[PDB]
Structure 1
Amino acid sequence: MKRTFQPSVLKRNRSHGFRARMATKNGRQVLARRRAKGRARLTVSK
């Protein structure tokens, strides 16, 4: 059947991309948390 994940690069980057996170202070807190934890991959972008 049709499962819940249907990949779409445009929708993925618009929803969770670097510029989408940087656009609000809550997204910037997401990025700050992930930098503090030391994530190699900050967002989905690459």
Structure 2
Amino acid sequence: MKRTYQPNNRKRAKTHGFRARMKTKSGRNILARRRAKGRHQLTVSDE
């Protein structure tokens, strides 16, 4: 009955982290998209 979400600070920082989004173009597109929405840090790194 192990469930889907098994936390992990290095996992989450690695995939999803701001350095990871900034790497690929399409990630930087997620960054421009969220900034445009004015999200309170959509970037997952250190909120």
Task: Please report the TM-score for the alignment, with normalisation by the length of structure 2.
Answer: 0.91
Tell me the SS of whatever aligns to 1:16.
Answer: coil
Letter in 2 for 1:37: K
What is the percent sequence identity of the aligned residues? 70
**Root-mean-square deviation over aligned CA pairs:** 0.7
Runs of 4+, deviation exceeding 4 Å: none
Offset at residue 42 of structure 1 (A): 2.3
Q: Which has the higher contact order (CA 8 A, sep 6+)?
A: 1
Ranges in structure 2 where 5+ consecutive residues have no aligned partner? none
Match of 1:2 in 2: 2
Q: Distance in 1 between matches of 2:41 and 2:2?
A: 29
Q: What TM-score do the two structures reach when normalised by structure 1?
A: 0.93
How many residues matched? 46
